Amino acid sequence: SGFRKMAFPSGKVEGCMVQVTCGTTTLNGLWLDDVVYCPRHVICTSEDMLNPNYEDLLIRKSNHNFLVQAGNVQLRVIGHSMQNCVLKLKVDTANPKTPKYKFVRIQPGQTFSVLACYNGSPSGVYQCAMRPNFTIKGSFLNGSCGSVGFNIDYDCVSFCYMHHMELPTGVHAGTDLEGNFYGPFVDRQTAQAAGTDTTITVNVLAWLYAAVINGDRWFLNRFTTTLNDFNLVAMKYNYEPLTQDHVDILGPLSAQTGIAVLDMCASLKELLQNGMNGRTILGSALLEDEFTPFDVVRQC
Amino acid sequence: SGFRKMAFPSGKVEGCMVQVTCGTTTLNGLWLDDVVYCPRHVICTSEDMLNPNYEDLLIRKSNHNFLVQAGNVQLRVIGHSMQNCVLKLKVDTANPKTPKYKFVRIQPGQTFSVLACYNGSPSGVYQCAMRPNFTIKGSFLNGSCGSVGFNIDYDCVSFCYMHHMELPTGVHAGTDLEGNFYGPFVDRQTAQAAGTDTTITVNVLAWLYAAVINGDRWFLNRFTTTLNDFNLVAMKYNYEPLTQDHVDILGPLSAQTGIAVLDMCASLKELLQNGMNGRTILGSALLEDEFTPFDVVRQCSGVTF
Numbered sequence: 001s002g003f004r005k006m007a008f009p010s011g012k013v014e015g016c017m018v019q020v021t022c023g024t025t026t027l028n029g030l031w032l033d034d035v036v037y038c039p040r041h042v043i044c045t046s047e048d049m050l051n052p053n054y055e056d057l058l059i060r061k062s063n064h065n066f067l068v069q070a071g072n073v074q075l076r077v078i079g080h081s082m083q084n085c086v087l088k089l090k091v092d093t094a095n096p097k098t099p100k101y102k103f104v105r106i107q108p109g110q111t112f113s114v115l116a117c118y119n120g121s122p123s124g125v126y127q128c129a130m131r132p133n134f135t136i137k138g139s140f141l142n143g144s145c146g147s148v149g150f151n152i153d154y155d156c157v158s159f160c161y162m163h164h165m166e167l168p169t170g171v172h173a174g175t176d177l178e179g180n181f182y183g184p185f186v187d188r189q190t191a192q193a194a195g196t197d198t199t200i201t202v203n204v205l206a207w208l209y210a211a212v213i214n215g216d217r218w219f220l221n222r223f224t225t226t227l228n229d230f231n232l233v234a235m236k237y238n239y240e241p242l243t244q245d246h247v248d249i250l251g252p253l254s255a256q257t258g259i260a261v262l263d264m265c266a267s268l269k270e271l272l273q274n275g276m277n278g279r280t281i282l283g284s285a286l287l288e289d290e291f292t293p294f295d296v297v298r299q300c
Numbered sequence: 301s302g303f304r305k306m307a308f309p310s311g312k313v314e315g316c317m318v319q320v321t322c323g324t325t326t327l328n329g330l331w332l333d334d335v336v337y338c339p340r341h342v343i344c345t346s347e348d349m350l351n352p353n354y355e356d357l358l359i360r361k362s363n364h365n366f367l368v369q370a371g372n373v374q375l376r377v378i379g380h381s382m383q384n385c386v387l388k389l390k391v392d393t394a395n396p397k398t399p400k401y402k403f404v405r406i407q408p409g410q411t412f413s414v415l416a417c418y419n420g421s422p423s424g425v426y427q428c429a430m431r432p433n434f435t436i437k438g439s440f441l442n443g444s445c446g447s448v449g450f451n452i453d454y455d456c457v458s459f460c461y462m463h464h465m466e467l468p469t470g471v472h473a474g475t476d477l478e479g480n481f482y483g484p485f486v487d488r489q490t491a492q493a494a495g496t497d498t499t500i501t502v503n504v505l506a507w508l509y510a511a512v513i514n515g516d517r518w519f520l521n522r523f524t525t526t527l528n529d530f531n532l533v534a535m536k537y538n539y540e541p542l543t544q545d546h547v548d549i550l551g552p553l554s555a556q557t558g559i560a561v562l563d564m565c566a567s568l569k570e571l572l573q574n575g576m577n578g579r580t581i582l583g584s585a586l587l588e589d590e591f592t593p594f595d596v597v598r599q600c601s602g603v604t605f
């Protein structure tokens with residue numbers, strides 16, 4: 001019993017964190033096999049942050065301009081290339097602690113663990129979700145760039161995020177491990193704003209199922225709803241539309257608890273209308289949307 | 301920016317997790333040097349659990365009755381002994397991944413990271429606090445016994461908790477690494493109930509400072525209070541008393557934000573008597589009490605391990 005925001009154990013990722021220095025800038029890199037991946041903005045100066053020409057800046061660099069430190073050992077860069085917004089530094093040593101891994105691009109609503117790092121050293125691990133506006137609500141200070149988001153599948157690490165920047169509202173933007181940004185963001189200091197965020201509806205429903213599995217039933221009601229009526233109500237509270245894919249994904253939780261998805265959708269509509277009235281669900285006074293249907297099944 | 305419930309990086313502890321099997325029971329063990337530590341209830345049957353004589357049950361066991369598995373390698377047990385509610389299995393191999401470590405007993409209100417394990421394999425890591433009623437509000441399924449709680453200080457792991465059981469309310473009880481239970485709990489299948497819990501006041505204040513550091517100031521007010529008046533109010537809402545030690549510990553956060561501790565207590569007093577009024581603090585509609593003053597400083601200053 002119990003329901004916690006739970007991150008994956010970070011050990012497999014910790015053995016991959018290195019420090020990358022280029023001139024006066026120091027950030028984190030991910031060392032897998034003989035390649036160190038890091039945000040390409042490590043090559044930028046003060047004059048190169050509004051409109052950097054990364055191809056132009058990178059061509060002026062030599063391998064010895066990149067200082068890579070893995071623990072107290074300096075690694076030798078023997079090649080460099082850019083793939084979208086990530087810099088790939090070929091090193092003369094394969095990381096002996098390289099886990100079984102994959103690079104996966106995730107969709108909004110998906111969760112992942114973040115190993116927040118500074119100077120190539122892991123400082124904390126937390127859990128977050130890719131918001132519908134493609135930002136993440138992380139906990140990051142200056143120097144955290146290059147920190148990664150991941151999930152674990154048995155013994156395989158799926159790297160899904162690399163931290164690049166903090167937007168004016170304090171939220172964070174980054175890329176997959178192929179350097180493709182999540183969202184309409186660019187690695188430039190030009191004025192950028194995250195779109196209005198919305199609640200991840202499928203995740204809230206999954207968390208309501210987690211609460212039922214844990215014995216919390218106060219919010220249940222005798223009503224059901226059509227998918228369309230639910231979506232008309234949901235949109236008014238800035239909740240993401242619930243698709244037939246989401247209904248299908250909630251099938252196993254629906255089968256386990258005996259509460260049909262549209263029946264739970266009517267509970268959610270009622271909660272949105274009434275609030276909680278001094279009550280909590282799984283120790284929370286707000287509807288939690290950073291647990292996917294997959295997370296709920298795994299944890300329960 | 302941002303404020304998350306953040307656990308310590310679990311790698312140093314992951315390299316210590318092993319699976320311990322005794323008869324039909326399988327749980328987790330902590331392999332440090334040449335000793336595997338695990339809950340002594342691994343030697344119990346369902347009947348033994350009802351009223352166990354652990355000295356009697358342990359004397360009947362031989363080293364070969366304990367199957368210890370570290371990854372896909374079986375370790376050989378060469379000795380066994382009991383220290384309070386923890387079983388210590390001497391193995392013929394020192395764990396090459398043994399980090400610098402200490403066994404520390406924590407106080408209620410202190411936080412720590414839990415590496416939840418099943419079959420000697422780490423499955424998740426989460427941050428929690430030792431409640432004032434000595435339970436932890438964890439997330440554990442059957443097979444999680446032997447999962448450990450820890451903190452990291454520089455490169456040293458301080459092991460502070462080992463999971464033993466789930467109480468009827470769904471909360472969890474366990475011991476320090478010397479086998480001494482936190483709280484008035486016993487390792488027996490019997491009627492046990494956690495006491496009425498209270499809010500960790502010093503931690504709520506630390507989290508209010510974290511909110512101010514992150515730009516959330518709506519709850520601040522012009523008022524201050526005496527420590528006695530605050531404690532009279534706090535006692536009424538099932539909040540732990542705030543001591544002069546807690547006030548001193550909140551000193552650095554008070555200096556950084558410019559809000560005296562008793563000034564933040566007057567904000568907390570008003571939050572208690574009046575509620576949040578539709579507002580949130582750090583994305584929460586409840587006052588969070590599972591971040592200590594040290595956790596707030598660590599997170600808002602980026603300390604690494």
Ligand SMILES: O=C(Cc1cncc(Cl)c1)Nc1cncc2ccccc12
Pocket residue numbers: 041049140141142143144145164165166167172186187188189301
């Ligand atoms: O945002 C940047 C640098 C940067 C700026 N403009 C564009 C790019 Cl691609 C990168 N860094 C930071 C990341 N995360 C949290 C931070 C908290 C404080 C200060 C800096 C932080």
Ligand SMILES: O=C(Cc1cncc(Cl)c1)Nc1cncc2ccccc12
Pocket residue numbers: 001341349440441442443444445464465466467472486487488489490
């Ligand atoms: O509580 C026990 C076994 C036990 C029973 N009586 C006394 C002792 Cl010392 C130990 N196990 C469990 C621990 N944590 C979460 C669990 C969720 C479901 C089922 C079992 C769980």
Ligand SMILES: [Cl-]
Pocket residue numbers: 549552553593594597
């Ligand atoms: Cl402090």
